[PDB]
């Protein structure tokens, strides 16, 4: 597995620019904010509802250990 022996490819062209020809920060807080609002809207409904179930079990669990004592 070295570079000129990996795959076979035809008819694709690549254009690139030098690092000294470029700006470091073209857009940082004018695309950085709406792009993470797209990536957050895609993940939230898969990741958050299991942790809302740990919260409702922690809150009920540490409320039947207090009232077991002192009537």
């Amino acid at each position: 597995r070295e570079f000129g022996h990996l795959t076979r490819m035809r008819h694709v062209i690549t254009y690139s620019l030098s690092p000294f020809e470029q700006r470091a920060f073209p857009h940082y807080f004018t695309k950085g904010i709406p792009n993470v609002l797209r990536r957050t809207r895609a993940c939230i409904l898969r990741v958050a509802p299991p942790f809302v179930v740990f919260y409702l079990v922690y809150t009920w669990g540490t409320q039947e250990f207090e009232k077991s004592k002192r009537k």
């Binding site: 898969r46 990741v47 509802p49 299991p50 942790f51 179930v53 740990f54 079990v57 922690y58 009920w60 669990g61 039947e64 250990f65 077991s68």
Partner: peptide
């Protein structure tokens, strides 16, 4: 959805392991 049900179940087992052995 099943992958993060499994992560939220290892958080539950970490909390329970530091509690005393009573009813809830």
């Amino acid at each position: 959805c099943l992958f993060w049900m499994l992560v939220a179940d290892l958080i539950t087992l970490t909390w329970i392991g530091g509690q005393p052995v009573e009813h809830p």
